[PDB]
Amino acid sequence: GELKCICQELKAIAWELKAIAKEDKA
Amino acid sequence: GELKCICQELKAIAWELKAIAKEDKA
Amino acid sequence: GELKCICQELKAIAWELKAIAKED
Amino acid sequence: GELKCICQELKAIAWELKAIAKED
Amino acid sequence: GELKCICQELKAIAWELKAIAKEDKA
Amino acid sequence: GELKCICQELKAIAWELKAIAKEDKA
């Protein structure tokens, strides 16, 4: 339900921040 | 209900971070 | 109650992120 | 309660992002 | 329990953002 | 279950923000 939805969007956020982190480093 | 509001806002946040992650590149 | 509180602060966060993404 | 705790940390998050948005 | 887990991680997120905001004066 | 999934993703987000905060420190 909505809890699975919330976990899925949090995973999305984590992966966007990893992209921001690697680029920032670069 | 409120759990749906929460999921929808996390989707918005994920999308804005995608924009920030892309911007820094382009 | 408390769930509505959480919803409203996530709206506030999405809104600050929108300001950040625009000015960048 | 843990829910109040969660809403309070989200406000603290929105606060810092407002500082990042205003600065940038 | 897991709700205490979630509050603690949000505290950790708010702390890293406070660090980013403080160094952001550049 | 679902709440543990949420906590785990928040840990992942906190870790990426830590990386960002430390890069920025430089």
Cα–Cα dist C8/D17, whole Å:
15
CB atoms within 10 A of CB C6: 23
Cα–Cα dist A3/B3, whole Å:
7
C10–D7 C-beta distance less than 8 A = no
Chains that touch C (3 or more CB pairs under 8 A): B, D
B14–A12 C-beta distance less than 8 A = yes
- Cβ neighbors of E6 (< 8 A, separation 6 or more) are D2, D6, F3, F6, F7, F10
Domains of chain B by residue range:
1-26
CA distance A15 to chain F (A): 8
Chain mean position to CA A20 = 10
Which amino acid appears at position B2 of this protein?
E
Cβ contacts (< 8 Å) between B19 and chain C: which residues?
A: 21
Which residue in E17, E19, F22 sits closest to A25, CA to CA? Answer: F22
Decide: C13 and B11 in contact? Cβ < 8 Å. Answer: no
